[PDB]
Amino acid sequence: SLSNKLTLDKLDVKGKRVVMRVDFNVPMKNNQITNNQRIKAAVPSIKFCLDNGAKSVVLMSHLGRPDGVPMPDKYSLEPVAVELKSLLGKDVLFLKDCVGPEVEKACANPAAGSVILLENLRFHVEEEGKGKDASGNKVKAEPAKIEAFRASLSKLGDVYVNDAFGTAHRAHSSMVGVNLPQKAGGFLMKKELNYFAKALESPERPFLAILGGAKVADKIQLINNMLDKVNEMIIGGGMAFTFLKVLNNMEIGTSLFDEEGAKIVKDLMSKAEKNGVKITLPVDFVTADKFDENAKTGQATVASGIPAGWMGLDCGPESSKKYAEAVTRAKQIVWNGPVGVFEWEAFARGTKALMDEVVKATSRGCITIIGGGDTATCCAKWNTEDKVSHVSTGGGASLELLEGKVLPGVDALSNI
Numbered sequence: 001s002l003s004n005k006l007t008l009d010k011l012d013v014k015g016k017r018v019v020m021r022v023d024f025n026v027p028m029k030n031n032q033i034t035n036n037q038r039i040k041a042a043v044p045s046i047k048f049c050l051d052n053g054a055k056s057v058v059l060m061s062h063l064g065r066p067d068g069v070p071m072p073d074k075y076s077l078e079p080v081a082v083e084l085k086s087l088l089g090k091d092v093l094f095l096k097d098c099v100g101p102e103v104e105k106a107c108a109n110p111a112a113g114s115v116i117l118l119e120n121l122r123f124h125v126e127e128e129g130k131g132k133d134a135s136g137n138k139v140k141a142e143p144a145k146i147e148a149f150r151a152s153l154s155k156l157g158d159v160y161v162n163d164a165f166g167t168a169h170r171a172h173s174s175m176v177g178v179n180l181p182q183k184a185g186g187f188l189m190k191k192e193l194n195y196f197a198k199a200l201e202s203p204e205r206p207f208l209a210i211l212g213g214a215k216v217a218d219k220i221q222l223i224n225n226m227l228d229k230v231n232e233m234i235i236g237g238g239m240a241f242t243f244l245k246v247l248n249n250m251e252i253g254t255s256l257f258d259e260e261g262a263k264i265v266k267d268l269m270s271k272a273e274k275n276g277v278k279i280t281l282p283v284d285f286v287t288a289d290k291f292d293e294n295a296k297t298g299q300a301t302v303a304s305g306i307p308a309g310w311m312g313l314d315c316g317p318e319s320s321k322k323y324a325e326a327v328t329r330a331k332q333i334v335w336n337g338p339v340g341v342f343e344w345e346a347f348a349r350g351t352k353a354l355m356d357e358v359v360k361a362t363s364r365g366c367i368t369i370i371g372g373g374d375t376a377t378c379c380a381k382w383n384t385e386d387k388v389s390h391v392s393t394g395g396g397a398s399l400e401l402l403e404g405k406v407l408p409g410v411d412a413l414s415n416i
Ligand SMILES: Nc1ncnc2c1ncn2[C@@H]1O[C@H](COP(=O)(O)OP(=O)(O)O)[C@@H](O)[C@H]1O
Pocket: 212, 213, 214, 215, 236, 237, 238, 256, 312, 313, 314, 336, 337, 338, 339, 340, 341, 342, 343, 371, 372, 373, 374, 375, 376, 394, 395, 396
């Protein structure tokens, strides 16, 4: 946690320019923000800096996975700037880049109280260290250029704050590479780390983890360590199909599949058996003939398989019944990742049914923790934010805490 680290409440910001990493990677639909949770969560740190006399606050974040190519068409942070203005009651200057001489000039000596938002960090390959070129070939950033990127970010403030809890599992340039003498954790980082420290110290048992979503390559690699902490796991959403293909030889069509993760599925199941972790996988599905809101839909089971060219985008009723049975057994639940494409109504029933069960569980004393940019948007969509124990801004970041890891964005902060 942060007991050993500098935090914003101990940082003198009067007359200082503050460069602040935030997680403004908000969900979007029809080019509009669908949930401003992650933006509102950063307002306490921003307002604290302004109220205590900061010369300026320079905000930097990524949006989506543009893979090191500028894509202002679909991944610009400009809409976040307009949303942040109304949440702050103050104007926000949006810059169309995050590094280079023009950005440096705009941030060098701003008018007192200026709030500046920079363009998407991941438009530059040096933020993640790797990406793709505009033709889609995978590329690696050059070390000299990564150092220059970090040096440019470091010029934009006198002191650094990291409030980007949702990104704190990423050792990316903006998260671990800023070279300023004082590097402090923000109030969202403190709030989230303190909550999880308490909730993970001696979880109530049975402790269920619900793992869904679409970031299969990343998150399947977290299960091994989770199996030492939990008593049950639901594996749903896009995660399930890699398991069902390997274990059941199920036909999955064009459903999400991770070739590298497929190679560890049997090892994970053996470890779950060794550790007494009950694994619940879906047994039926809502299918789609294309990845589209208005796709033709169908039904499938594990026995039937998903037809060629179709994809499973939600679980079916028998799966929901099994998910509900595990939720009913739990005394503590951590849930990251919707169990279907809940943004599209044809494919939202399984996630809504599961949310209903989690809310009922909270009512009878279960500790229920929902985290993630997209999973927290389920809470907003069905108006359950106040009906679960905690809604976190971190998804993958919360799973890495469940694993017992120190997060790089925390580790990179100054020590007291
Ligand atoms: N079966 C599926 N196929 C493809 N995508 C899915 C499936 N089930 C859920 N998803 C997607 O998972 C996405 C969220 O995944 P992720 O970003 O890992 O979750 P979070 O943001 O909560 O951490 C949602 O946008 C949802 O559409």
